[PDB]
UniProtKB/TrEMBL annotation, chain B:
This is Ribosomal protein l34-like protein. The chain holds residues 61 to 119 of 119 of the full protein. It comes from Chaetomium thermophilum (strain DSM 1495 / CBS 144.50 / IMI 039719). Belongs to the eukaryotic ribosomal protein eL34 family. It comes from the Eukaryota. Zn(2+) binds at C22, C25.
UniProtKB/TrEMBL annotation, chain C:
It holds the Pfam family Ribosomal_L37ae. Zn(2+) binds at C38, C41, C56, C59. This is 60S ribosomal protein L43-like protein. One of its GO terms (molecular function) is structural constituent of ribosome. Belongs to the eukaryotic ribosomal protein eL43 family. GO terms for cellular component: ribonucleoprotein complex; ribosome.
From TrEMBL, chain D:
It is found in: Nucleus, Nucleolus; Nucleus, Nucleoplasm. Coiled coil: none annotated. This is Pescadillo homolog. Component of the NOP7 complex, which is required for maturation of the 25S and 5.8S ribosomal RNAs and formation of the 60S ribosome.
TrEMBL record, chain E:
InterPro entries: Ribosomal_eL30 (IPR000231), Ribosomal_eL30-like (IPR039109), Ribosomal_eL30-like_sf (IPR029064), Ribosomal_eL30_CS (IPR022991), Ribosomal_eL8/eL30/eS12/Gad45 (IPR004038). It comes from the Eukaryota. This is 60S ribosomal protein l30-like protein. GO terms for cellular component: cytosolic large ribosomal subunit. Belongs to the eukaryotic ribosomal protein eL30 family. The lineage of its organism: Eukaryota, Fungi, Dikarya, Ascomycota, Pezizomycotina.
Amino acid sequence: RKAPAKFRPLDYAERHGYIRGIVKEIIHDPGRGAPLARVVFRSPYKYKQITETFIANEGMYTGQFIYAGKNAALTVGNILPLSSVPEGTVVSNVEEKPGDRGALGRTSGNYVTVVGHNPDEGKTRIKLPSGAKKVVPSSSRGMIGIVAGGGRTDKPLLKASRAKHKFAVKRNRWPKTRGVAMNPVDHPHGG
Amino acid sequence: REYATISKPKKTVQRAYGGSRCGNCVRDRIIRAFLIEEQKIVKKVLKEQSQAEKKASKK
Amino acid sequence: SKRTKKVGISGKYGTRYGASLRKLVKKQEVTQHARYTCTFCGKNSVRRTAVGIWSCKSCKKTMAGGAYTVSTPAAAAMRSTLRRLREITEA
Amino acid sequence: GKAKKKGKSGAARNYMTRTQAVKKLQLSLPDFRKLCIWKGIYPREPRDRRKVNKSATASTTFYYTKDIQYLLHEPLLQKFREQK
Amino acid sequence: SIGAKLALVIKSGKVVLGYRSTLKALRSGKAKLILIAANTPPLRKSELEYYSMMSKTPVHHYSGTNIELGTACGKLFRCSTMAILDAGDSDILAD
RNA sequence: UUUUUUUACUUAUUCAAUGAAGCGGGGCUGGACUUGCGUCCAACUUCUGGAGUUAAGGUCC
RNA sequence: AGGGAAGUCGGCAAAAUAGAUCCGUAACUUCGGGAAAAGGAUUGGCUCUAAGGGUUGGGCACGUGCGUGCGGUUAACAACCAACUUAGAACUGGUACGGACAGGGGGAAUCUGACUGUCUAAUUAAAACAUAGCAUUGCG
RNA sequence: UCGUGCCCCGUGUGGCGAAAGGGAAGCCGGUUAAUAUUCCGGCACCUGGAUGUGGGUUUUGCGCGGCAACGCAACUGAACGCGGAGACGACGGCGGGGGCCCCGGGCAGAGUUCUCUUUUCUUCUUAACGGUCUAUCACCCUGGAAACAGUUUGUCUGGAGAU
RNA sequence: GAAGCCAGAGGAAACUCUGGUGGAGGCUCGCAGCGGUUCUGACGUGCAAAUCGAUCGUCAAAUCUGAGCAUGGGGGCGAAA
Ligand SMILES: [Zn+2]
């Protein structure tokens, strides 16, 4: 892992217009089931250009132009505030608050559905992958489409080695010893 | 570090982006640059025509 | 000459892991190891490099896709309703 | 021995520009020019001025580093500061 | 209908299939029509459109892929762009 | 003058982001409704895996 | 020697099997296996035979060792060079021919844990642990 | 020069941490009782600095040639940027090269020799650093392929231009 | 001897059969290594405060291993004894 998968910081260009980036690489992130996309944008304030790391939505490809901003079009890979999309649109990496660079709908094959808008208070009702309903500020951003790599869990792991390879880079506790197999001093289930 | 000991024409090709990009990519860069600036001129002409038509309609 | 009756690519696993589990894994292995037609250049050279990552050997395009297939039906249907919503918004 | 780095010896150590000399002495420009005229510090010309300063032009003035080091011990500096 | 017209041109008229022969036809200035497949790379598409604009040659954007354009031409290989030099007995030029 | 309820506020306190870069309010221009001129809403880049940096210029000295 | 588990709690230990070529191989099965299942025929030495390769090389007519215009696919022919396998046959010694060495005994079943893997260093390697698969709970 | 100022830029913060990771550069012969890619002899290389000579460039100021891939002893290049190298898993068979092993001849030496054995054995070597001519992939030019072709042990490649 | 691939024979096609090719597997016999099943084994004030012989398990990986570094006793670590 090199960089976290985050949106650009919410700046003037994304707040008032759109800024274009180019997708250079689609790479594998160890410990994550979804691919990442390296996207290069221009800096509006200096000559050097800025490289970002996004969670890649399905259908994204190398050499593709994507657009981030309020006035961006409704196309897969574009990053828009939730007030700029219609109801029924699914999005990925949805910010909980405008500016935290993405919190919701990030794993492979997952998305967040825009259920509705309350334009008077500037709120948006969304449906989460677990089925929960949430209300977020309408200026929260999201990337149009579904996170790539869907259907990963359908294939059986089939082997203790494949489970070990999965969890070694994930740091999760493996193998798992049952608490009932322990002594009474080791676990409350021990004995 | 062995590249610091050899002369410049051995480390490059006598072409734009020589020793950094290959000939096919340089040709693609030239054609893409020319076509995109021509399209920018065309789009600016079309925008000026539409602006003149809108100004004539408003006036 | 067909060498196995039913196991196919799952024949590398022998008698282990159970018949239903081998049959379940067989679909994913077949789809993840098949070659696909590139939507950009039209050649049958698109293959998986990592999970969700599909690259074309000819035109060198790399595409974010499904875990074991190039596209998922959910994403294809999503593209269809996205086109419908974009048409409604523009019109 | 350990490998030397480029630009750490030779004319780069031998010459200093007027800007570098003024910053080394922490003087103003009129005081520096006054002190150079009074102490006999003369402009010098390196064989290759890019070896001394990569932004140097044909109008860049160079001095001997040892001459500026000698100027560091002139008692007129404290007189300048006392008058200010 | 464009497939039927294309089949008529293959049967009666004269065509060249492929990028380099299409460019040679446009340079010669005897090309009557250019067909560009949908999945042709945008750089090559812009280059072909510029050549056809400078030679005053009509351009048809074929909605199929290069596989479909080759099948429409009646070949067993793909074709991203092609040039009609002689219409033959077809009315593909009248459009 | 004081006790409860809710009902606003910001200055204590708390959280987050940024290279603390474009916040708030006006002006100019265009579009809509309105009253017969007040709101709100918009300025700016979308065929292409190019390039974009040392201000060109105008006008007073 | 003869007998062949009569020994012993118990075939413990030992003996028997073993390489390779060929014939042949059951129930059961998650169809992948079981399987080297089982059960058989052979193996030395010598003198021969057969099969399996490589390299180089075409006639005319002009300009002059190269360029054309031809013409022909029996080079299916010559010259030179080279190695290790495989199959077949005769003859011959024999108490032995995988002559030392090296090298599965096999079969019918029952219980049991799915399997590969792991632990009580210095009395317990296992029906214990782990495992993939499955199910539940909590968290926006 | 209102002489005691003005301008530009943004990226943060230092150190330790590998005699198996990364990394500038040395080979051969000889030499001691005991050290040697360290000593001696011969023949080289790397890094940094200064400043000459020759050659090059220029009066069309910052080279020329090739359609091209690109070549050639040179052949300006600050700020600010882009890119490459450093820099990378495991396993499988296939092909090239060094060294080793094996076979034949020849000179020289040694052993065997009742008989046999034109016999059996030993030496027959060539460094770093350079020059020159070559070596799979790949790329360029012509041209336009179905009666599809090329092609690996392994079926990949081609009108996105194969043979 | 798994996918993939070639050829031949069928089949309207899907597919079916035959012969090759290929080289998969927490597959298997087995050398080193790693481990430690058995033996009225050797040894029993030993060569050894756990060693020796034969035999055995595993042997391309959940394999074996060095150095650097991290976790410290109300703790750690633990495929859990
Ligand atoms: Zn492609």
